[PDB]
Amino acid sequence: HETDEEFDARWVTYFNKPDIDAWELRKGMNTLVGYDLVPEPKIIDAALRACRRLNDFASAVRILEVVKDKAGPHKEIYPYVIQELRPTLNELGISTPEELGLDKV
Amino acid sequence: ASGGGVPTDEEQATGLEREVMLAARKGQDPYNILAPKATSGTKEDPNLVPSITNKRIVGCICEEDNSTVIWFWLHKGEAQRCPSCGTHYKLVPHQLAH
Amino acid sequence: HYEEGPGKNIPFSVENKWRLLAMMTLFFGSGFAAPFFIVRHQLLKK
Amino acid sequence: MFINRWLFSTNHKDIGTLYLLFGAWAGMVGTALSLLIRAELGQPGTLLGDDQIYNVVVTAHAFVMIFFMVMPIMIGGFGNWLVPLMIGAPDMAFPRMNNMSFWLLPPSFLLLLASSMVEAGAGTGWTVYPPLAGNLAHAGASVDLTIFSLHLAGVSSILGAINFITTIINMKPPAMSQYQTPLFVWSVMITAVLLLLSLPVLAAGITMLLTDRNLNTTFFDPAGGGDPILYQHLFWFFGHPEVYILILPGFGMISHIVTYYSGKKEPFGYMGMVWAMMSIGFLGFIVWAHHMFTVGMDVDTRAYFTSATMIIAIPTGVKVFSWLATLHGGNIKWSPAMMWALGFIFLFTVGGLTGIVLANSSLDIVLHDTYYVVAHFHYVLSMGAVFAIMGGFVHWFPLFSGYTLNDTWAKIHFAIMFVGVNMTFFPQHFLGLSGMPRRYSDYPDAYTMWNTISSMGSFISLTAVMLMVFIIWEAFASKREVLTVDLTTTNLEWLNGCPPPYHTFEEPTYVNLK
Amino acid sequence: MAYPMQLGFQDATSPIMEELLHFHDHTLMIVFLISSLVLYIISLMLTTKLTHTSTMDAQEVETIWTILPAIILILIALPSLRILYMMDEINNPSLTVKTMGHQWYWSYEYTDYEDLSFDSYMIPTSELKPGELRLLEVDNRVVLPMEMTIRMLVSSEDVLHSWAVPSLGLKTDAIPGRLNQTTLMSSRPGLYYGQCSEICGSNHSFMPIVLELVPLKYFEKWSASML
Amino acid sequence: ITAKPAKTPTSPKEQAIGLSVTFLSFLLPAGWVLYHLDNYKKS
Amino acid sequence: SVVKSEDYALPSYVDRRDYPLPDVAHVKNLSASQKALKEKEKASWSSLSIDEKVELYRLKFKESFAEMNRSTNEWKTVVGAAMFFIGFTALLLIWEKHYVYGPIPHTFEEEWVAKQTKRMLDMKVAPIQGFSAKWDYDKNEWKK
Amino acid sequence: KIKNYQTAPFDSRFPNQNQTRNCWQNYLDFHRCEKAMTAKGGDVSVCEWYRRVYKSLCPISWVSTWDDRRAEGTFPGKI
Amino acid sequence: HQTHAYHMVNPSPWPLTGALSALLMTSGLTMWFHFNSMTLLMIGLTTNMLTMYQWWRDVIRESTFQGHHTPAVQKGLRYGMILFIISEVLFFTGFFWAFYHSSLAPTPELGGCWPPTGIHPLNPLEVPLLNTSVLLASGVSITWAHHSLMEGDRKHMLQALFITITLGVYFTLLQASEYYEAPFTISDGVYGSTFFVATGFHGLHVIIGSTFLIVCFFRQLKFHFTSNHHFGFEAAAWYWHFVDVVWLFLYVSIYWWGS
Amino acid sequence: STALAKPQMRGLLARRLRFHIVGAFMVSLGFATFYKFAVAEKRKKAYADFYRNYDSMKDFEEMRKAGIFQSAK
Amino acid sequence: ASAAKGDHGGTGARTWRFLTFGLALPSVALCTLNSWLHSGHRERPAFIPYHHLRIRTKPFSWGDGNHTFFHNPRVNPLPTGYEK
Amino acid sequence: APDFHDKYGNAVLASGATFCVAVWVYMATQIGIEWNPSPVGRVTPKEWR
Amino acid sequence: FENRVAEKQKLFQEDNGLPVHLKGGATDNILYRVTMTLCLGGTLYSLYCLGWASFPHK
Ligand SMILES: CCCCCCCCCCCCCCCCCC(=O)OCC(COC(=O)CCCCCCCCCCCCCCCCC)OC(=O)CCCCCCCCCCCCCCCCC
Ligand code: HEA
Ligand SMILES: CCCCC/C=C\C/C=C\C/C=C\C/C=C\CCCC(=O)O[C@H](COC(=O)CCCCCCCCCCCCCCCCC)COP(=O)(O)OCCN
Ligand SMILES: CCCCCC/C=C/CCCCCCCCCC(=O)O[C@H](COC(=O)CCCCCCCCCCCCCCC)COP(=O)(O)OC[C@@H](O)CO
Ligand SMILES: CCCCCCCCCCO[C@@H]1O[C@H](CO)[C@@H](O[C@H]2O[C@H](CO)[C@@H](O)[C@H](O)[C@H]2O)[C@H](O)[C@H]1O
Ligand code: CUA
Ligand SMILES: [Cu+2]
Ligand SMILES: [Mg+2]
Ligand code: NA
Ligand SMILES: [Zn+2]
């Protein structure tokens, strides 16, 4: 296959397609979470902006949830990713699952 | 030596056997004996899936020699995509026996 | 044609759960009881 | 209509239902016989006061569990229900012959019950070795009725094997190669090939036993120049393929259950799993004389059979590791069917390993005809096959019936069964190593402790069996109808709904070649 | 004989049986390791929220899990076959004894020199002398010289039986019309017990074997007294 | 899997009845035979 | 919102951590406020309130990840019930001992066992490890 | 003369577990020899080795059945 | 309305009647062997024959008369017949195993020789050689019948098939005469046991295959077969060649090598 | 506040697997060593010590005097 | 092998009929001559009541229990010898 | 909303374990079952001849 | 003889709802009733014989 950098760029390019449709957004996220990795912030950034172009706030929040879920017991990964996305979250007005209370069982 | 008196299929085949024989003669396959050949499967050139009803099961062998087949109902209407590979399919319904 | 659907693709009725309990009791209970009674039969012959 | 549907069937699903009902009823008979065995052994001394009856009970227990519970459920029941659905086929190749394979089984079973009711029964062992099974040591009708029972069961399975091979080879979608068919379908094809080749040899051997008993032949009688060991070779030439026949459709179901509840689209290493089942099936024909290491066999023959037997561990280990690798990375759903399959993987492995111990003919001299052999096959066969059957049953019951089980009750059932079988059979290893013979109605006093524990274990599995009947009742009593099922894109048998219509795939699936 | 709560093999009475004990220890270590490894990996597969569900490539790992099992089998087969061929090796016995199975008792023939033969039946439980063993004692034991290589020939006069003495590592089926040979050598005097080991009908459980191993000179005088 | 609520719910009391009857159907006939074994063994 | 049997062939909703974006929305028929909320969603999400963001989430999804992933007390019911039925099994075994089994052989009487044990030590049963190996023949007692 | 018999020695013609043919061959050899000696006016003493070997190896009931069938004229081996 | 080519069969009583005929035949053999009575066995043989007649009658109705045997259905029947013949090969293999086991290691009770003391085998160059030429010749004539059918020649198909059947009958009568004339019997130890059970099952298969050819003869007389579609004739020919090949193995093994 | 350092994000499942398979190998080595000392060598040494100065005639004489034999009183 | 004949321009109906009448049936005619020329009854051997022959472990299910199914009094002795 | 397990699970667990232990201990110790454990360290050997 | 297969094809394809084993007409029904009567009556007779054979008659 490919280097880490090539892999990440391919996924950035996938979600950055201007006219990506709702089916392709879902297909992308549902495929990406099959891999043994937590997606790089730059990939998540492009997917959240795809959500914006698709007028889909709910899926943006769900994407943040699945980043947390893919980290499993590695509790340091999700706050790092949120930290790195904070300018994007602010620019797009995306609230985190925690800010919405959706992390409580 | 050499005589006749044995009927031929043309003379004597009947029922479904005869339907298959006569359709094969016309190069048609109403009883699904052949594997269909794929199109490019894009949104502009989707695989055309005939049906005598409004939905039909598709199995998609996404890549040659995949052992996993991906199965789904294809409904009449807008073309749908394989949930594994994205290739497009569109149902073309109806008829058979005139 | 034949009945289709849950509860209909089977040779026994599930229309009443107590009649069903009695049928299943007799069915599985007769299989379970048979060897005990065959042993009894062989012991009673000598 | 009732007679037309259920006695004149030509429908693969209804026939599958008949086999499941038959096999379940047979499983009760077999369980009762097993409880009588362990009641006789549960304390020192005699319970029945009649060891000929004890031997008849042991013999019947094995024939019932093998020919009337496992094979009908796995091949007749799950095979008929699932194989046509998994390949998109509208029925079996020979839908009317299919119905005769089913209806031969109640008469076969009646002949076996007749054998135990007339005279003093056939107290032979399920091996039916002459001369004990001959017309001097077992005069009268019982052994002949047993022979005919096996004849009818053999014809049923040979014809079913023809049907399954033909269906699987001939009735797939034209684009689907054999390497695009699901592993359960492969496991049934390979089981059928084994049935096809092995049952005719058994039929030859038991027919010779029949003529020795009734037509004054002497195939197995030294007075006429015959040989009792010839019967053993013909019996075990069938009998080793038979134990792989008993487990292979279980391996198929386990591959599907583990894949499904791991949330995977596919088992790990599909072609390795195909290779492994074909290799097991092939090696299964060249190992039979490990059932005969104490009959007076030359040393080079013992060396060969020891080595060829052990080789089977290699393809079997590929399947075990591949199931583990299918779990690996899964989003595990801890459903009751998953618990049965995980129990299978562990307990089958224990039993397989004690089989490898027995394969060493030098150790088998001391372990042959002891409870170590009984412990081996109740782990691999009794537990392996039963746990795969229970896992398949719980997994596919909503497909077949349209109704759900109570999952909590099903987990309770698993837990009870798991304790019971392990308490019953694990101490039998000690009994075997310390030299207790199998097929005994009583034992020297030193063997009391493990026999006592083993018999208490058998009652725990009884409680599990009674609970299972209640759990099926409760599901049919409550009528929770299925709405949605996950992973249909890689589990075609679910895609026509629950239960599927009488006729499915009247319009076949569309599959492209590209 | 076995003793209560026994877990493993009876103590070895012959050098072949000591070989088998060491070979069983070796094989059982391997059995325990593999079964525990499988159980451990199961627990490992099931104890993480981390996932990986895309298609996995299998050929690298299938090399490991065919080669390593093949090596383990060879490591069992090598000592296994060594014992097998060592047992088969030429021994030259000093004595031949025949045993014939019957429903349901054993007979013995010692006909190298004189015509000595007798039948050997289980002692009924009601007739046991204080401290004798239920289902194991016989009226006439198989007296044999200790520390000597003995040829046993085994056959039957009716159905199949099997002549077994676990502490000597012996089990040889008794087949009418066939004369099966095995060799026996006890390192020690004493009483060594076995039981019929091929189902032979309603008293299969009740036709035991008892060997009585003594110095040659006692065996000679016992033989003479049994004529 | 998802399912509809039961069309004919089986309450805890109904379950206790079904379980009790199921268990007695296995236990009573075998129990009767085994209780009387000695009446058979010397009949 | 009602899921019917006759919808089996259509894409359906699922909550699965490994399938985070399901094929359809949780809520298919919207109220008039929900419809207007969906229009507002086409403008800056910074202008949505927290309650409105939560409502948009619950229109798309049924359970959150935290909810769908929660642990339960079912294990207590399973383990306790299994123990109850295993306890019930012992009642069957008490009945069997009382009503089915007669006396065991006289060879299990204490005095028989004491004599049989001496005779096993006299014949040196399992003298290397198993039995007589544990008897001290010099001190006439079991080894400590 | 060349004695000190203890038991039948290993015989490379019959090296395996089934010794039926070893018993049979020595029974035949003994009676063939005894027949040749008794006929040609010799002494059966030269037959003794085969006698000792078959007595050591053969079940008493085999020997007794074969002896009866020789006396009956139904023994199927050639002597 | 289906749009596959496979055959959904009408609900049928013949599987059940066939299974019950099996119960009656086996029960009946038990009653004959142990309770001195032929009654159940005669009922079972009669119901077995009725079952076979009606079942195969219906297959002819389904195919010749109703057209249900599409090429896919016919291909499945080809596989089914091949697999059936394989199972019959393995059945005979058990009897050849029994024969070689007993004859390669003859026991002392036999005199330690094969053939046993007191057995006078048939001369393999007399009637057994004639039987061999008869079955080989019938393999040649049935091949002539097959080619005449494919070439559309009704009269010569009938003549060749008649000749084939006549040869099968001749074999059966010859073997019946040999059985009567044989100086050994099935009770003459393992020589008679292997001889009569192995050639007896073979003779049963000759009668079965002859019957199958006779069914084909009457179907041909009624014009059922076309020049391209005649699977019952192909199946009967495959079975007939199987019967011929089993005979050659019997001849070489039991009559010749075993003499 | 303080930024968080970037953590390992890739191959976490594979990493866990390799760590624990190595651990399992080490434990298996430990067990083999325990077993060959607590079972296998223990057995060889028991038999070797038993027979090193074993007197079969003395053993027999003790059994004979205790009355166990039919052939020797 | 190639036998020693030839054709192979086409193995159709005319060729197989040629083989049927030209080779197969002449062969049967020759073997029929060979057989019905070595026929004629041969002198039956002395009766010897060998214990591996004329086996009777159970009476047969027909006749008097002591006659085989295709019993021929000329050449099949009973356990006690040839019939009167 | 509490399900069956939230409401009854602690009771089912506690009662089931208590009952299971009590009845097996009673069965194993109070009803005359002879386990025939090892004589080693427990039986005083007694003259038999 | 003459080829009458077409007449049989018309008969067995007649749209009368009969299953193939009865579609030849009244003689099919008679043969079916004979077969099933012998099978079921024989099966009942075999059960009677089991009952008889299950007990000693000294
Ligand atoms: C295996 C399936 C599950 C089994 C569950 C039920 C069994 C209970 C746990 C079960 C605990 C499993 C460990 C084995 C028992 C250890 C006893 C032993 O040292 O036995 C050694 C030998 C003979 O050894 C000897 O010559 C020396 C004897 C030393 C005496 C010391 C005093 C011992 C006191 C009495 C102990 C009572 C034993 C327990 C009595 C058991 C009553 C049921 O016996 C044998 O060969 C028996 C072994 C048969 C071969 C099959 C093994 C398959 C692997 C089992 C799973 C392991 C991974 C899971 C690890 C365990 C996960 C569960
Ligand atoms: C499901 C049925 C089943 C199965 C699958 C098996 C599988 C095996 N069995 Fe057996 N067996 C029986 C049912 C079965 N058996 C029965 C019923 C009998 C008794 C018949 C009678 O007498 O009544 C019997 C008897 C029997 C005997 C005769 C013992 C005697 O009578 O003295 C032997 C001897 O070799 C044997 C060996 C094996 C072996 C080596 C396997 C192998 O196929 C097992 C392979 C599996 C593994 C080894 C575990 C998984 C593998 C790994 C985890 C990989 C790594 C492993 C290693 C390197 C070892 N079995
Ligand atoms: C020209 C060839 C003709 C062959 C057929 C002849 C009539 C028999 C009818 C059925 C044949 C079926 C199978 C054959 C099985 C038994 C072998 C019999 C072959 C035969 O006919 O052997 C004859 C004896 O037959 C006997 O016992 C007669 C015995 C008749 C009763 C047979 C009992 C049936 C037992 C069959 C069980 C079959 C189980 C099949 C299982 C199939 C798979 C499930 C030999 O006669 P003889 O007087 O001993 O010697 C001749 C001396 N002059
Ligand atoms: C004394 C006499 C009785 C003795 C007892 C034994 C009885 C003898 C039974 C003889 C077997 C007769 C079989 C007749 C089958 C007729 C039906 C048939 O041949 O059916 C054909 C299908 O083949 C098919 O089912 C193929 C069906 C294959 C059947 C093979 C049967 C072998 C039976 C063996 C049974 C015993 C086994 C051995 C016992 C140890 C129909 O297709 P076509 O021919 O293409 O026609 C269609 C065309 O017309 C269209 O143009
Ligand atoms: C392995 C399978 C078996 C597992 C354990 C079975 C558990 C037993 C359940 C109870 O069975 C019943 O027990 C009664 C005794 O408790 C019996 O009554 C018997 O005893 C009563 C009291 O002595 C009398 O009143 C009755 O008439 C007399 O039949 C009764 O017949 C029997 O059905
Ligand atoms: Cu003699 Cu078992
Ligand atoms: Cu085997
Ligand atoms: Mg054995
Ligand atoms: Na007992
Ligand atoms: Zn695809």
PDB file of N, CA, C and O and ligand atoms in Angstrom, chain D residues 129 232 291-292 294-295 368-369 438-439, chain E residues 160-162 171 173 197-199, ligand 8:
ATOM      1  N   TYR D 129     -19.288 -55.000  16.678  1.00  0.00           N
ATOM      2  CA  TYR D 129     -18.243 -55.979  16.303  1.00  0.00           C
ATOM      3  C   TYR D 129     -18.749 -57.413  16.438  1.00  0.00           C
ATOM      4  O   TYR D 129     -19.258 -57.792  17.518  1.00  0.00           O
ATOM      5  N   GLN D 232     -13.847 -54.816  11.408  1.00  0.00           N
ATOM      6  CA  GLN D 232     -13.401 -53.578  12.037  1.00  0.00           C
ATOM      7  C   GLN D 232     -12.834 -52.617  10.996  1.00  0.00           C
ATOM      8  O   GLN D 232     -13.078 -51.406  11.069  1.00  0.00           O
ATOM      9  N   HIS D 291      -8.261 -46.569  15.208  1.00  0.00           N
ATOM     10  CA  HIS D 291      -9.270 -47.211  16.061  1.00  0.00           C
ATOM     11  C   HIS D 291      -8.931 -48.675  16.343  1.00  0.00           C
ATOM     12  O   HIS D 291      -9.760 -49.398  16.936  1.00  0.00           O
ATOM     13  N   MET D 292      -7.765 -49.138  15.902  1.00  0.00           N
ATOM     14  CA  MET D 292      -7.428 -50.557  15.962  1.00  0.00           C
ATOM     15  C   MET D 292      -5.979 -50.792  16.410  1.00  0.00           C
ATOM     16  O   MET D 292      -5.390 -51.834  16.120  1.00  0.00           O
ATOM     17  N   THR D 294      -4.762 -51.783  19.147  1.00  0.00           N
ATOM     18  CA  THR D 294      -4.541 -52.924  20.032  1.00  0.00           C
ATOM     19  C   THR D 294      -4.984 -54.269  19.428  1.00  0.00           C
ATOM     20  O   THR D 294      -4.906 -55.279  20.140  1.00  0.00           O
ATOM     21  N   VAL D 295      -5.290 -54.337  18.105  1.00  0.00           N
ATOM     22  CA  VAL D 295      -5.776 -55.611  17.561  1.00  0.00           C
ATOM     23  C   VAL D 295      -4.635 -56.553  17.150  1.00  0.00           C
ATOM     24  O   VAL D 295      -4.915 -57.677  16.715  1.00  0.00           O
ATOM     25  N   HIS D 368      -6.543 -46.902  25.052  1.00  0.00           N
ATOM     26  CA  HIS D 368      -7.606 -47.503  24.222  1.00  0.00           C
ATOM     27  C   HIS D 368      -8.637 -48.225  25.094  1.00  0.00           C
ATOM     28  O   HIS D 368      -8.281 -48.904  26.078  1.00  0.00           O
ATOM     29  N   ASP D 369      -9.932 -48.068  24.744  1.00  0.00           N
ATOM     30  CA  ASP D 369     -11.000 -48.745  25.498  1.00  0.00           C
ATOM     31  C   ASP D 369     -11.015 -48.348  26.980  1.00  0.00           C
ATOM     32  O   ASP D 369     -11.406 -49.132  27.844  1.00  0.00           O
ATOM     33  N   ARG D 438     -13.834 -48.394  29.380  1.00  0.00           N
ATOM     34  CA  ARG D 438     -15.159 -47.924  28.940  1.00  0.00           C
ATOM     35  C   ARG D 438     -16.071 -49.133  28.820  1.00  0.00           C
ATOM     36  O   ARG D 438     -15.624 -50.284  28.972  1.00  0.00           O
ATOM     37  N   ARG D 439     -17.357 -48.862  28.677  1.00  0.00           N
ATOM     38  CA  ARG D 439     -18.390 -49.853  28.442  1.00  0.00           C
ATOM     39  C   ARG D 439     -18.569 -50.769  29.654  1.00  0.00           C
ATOM     40  O   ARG D 439     -18.998 -51.892  29.481  1.00  0.00           O
TER      41      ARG D 439
ATOM     42  N   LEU E 160     -14.765 -61.334  21.072  1.00  0.00           N
ATOM     43  CA  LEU E 160     -13.544 -60.559  21.337  1.00  0.00           C
ATOM     44  C   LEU E 160     -13.437 -60.264  22.816  1.00  0.00           C
ATOM     45  O   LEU E 160     -14.453 -59.973  23.449  1.00  0.00           O
ATOM     46  N   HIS E 161     -12.202 -60.330  23.372  1.00  0.00           N
ATOM     47  CA  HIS E 161     -11.929 -59.774  24.703  1.00  0.00           C
ATOM     48  C   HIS E 161     -10.676 -58.935  24.515  1.00  0.00           C
ATOM     49  O   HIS E 161     -10.181 -58.811  23.396  1.00  0.00           O
ATOM     50  N   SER E 162     -10.149 -58.365  25.595  1.00  0.00           N
ATOM     51  CA  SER E 162      -8.842 -57.736  25.454  1.00  0.00           C
ATOM     52  C   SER E 162      -8.132 -57.817  26.792  1.00  0.00           C
ATOM     53  O   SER E 162      -8.700 -57.504  27.844  1.00  0.00           O
ATOM     54  N   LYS E 171      -1.920 -53.953  26.593  1.00  0.00           N
ATOM     55  CA  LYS E 171      -3.307 -54.198  26.205  1.00  0.00           C
ATOM     56  C   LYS E 171      -3.268 -54.868  24.846  1.00  0.00           C
ATOM     57  O   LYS E 171      -2.803 -54.260  23.864  1.00  0.00           O
ATOM     58  N   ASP E 173      -5.699 -57.225  22.197  1.00  0.00           N
ATOM     59  CA  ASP E 173      -7.018 -57.827  21.992  1.00  0.00           C
ATOM     60  C   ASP E 173      -6.925 -59.344  21.826  1.00  0.00           C
ATOM     61  O   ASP E 173      -5.952 -59.879  21.280  1.00  0.00           O
ATOM     62  N   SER E 197     -10.853 -55.513  28.267  1.00  0.00           N
ATOM     63  CA  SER E 197     -10.878 -54.178  27.639  1.00  0.00           C
ATOM     64  C   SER E 197     -11.414 -54.247  26.229  1.00  0.00           C
ATOM     65  O   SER E 197     -11.042 -53.404  25.376  1.00  0.00           O
ATOM     66  N   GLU E 198     -12.296 -55.218  25.938  1.00  0.00           N
ATOM     67  CA  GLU E 198     -13.093 -55.134  24.694  1.00  0.00           C
ATOM     68  C   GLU E 198     -14.470 -55.689  25.034  1.00  0.00           C
ATOM     69  O   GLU E 198     -14.593 -56.794  25.580  1.00  0.00           O
ATOM     70  N   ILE E 199     -15.523 -54.877  24.753  1.00  0.00           N
ATOM     71  CA  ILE E 199     -16.847 -55.263  25.208  1.00  0.00           C
ATOM     72  C   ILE E 199     -17.203 -56.628  24.642  1.00  0.00           C
ATOM     73  O   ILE E 199     -17.128 -56.882  23.414  1.00  0.00           O
TER      74      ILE E 199
HETATM   75 MG    MG N   8     -11.158 -52.144  21.715  1.00  0.00          MG
END
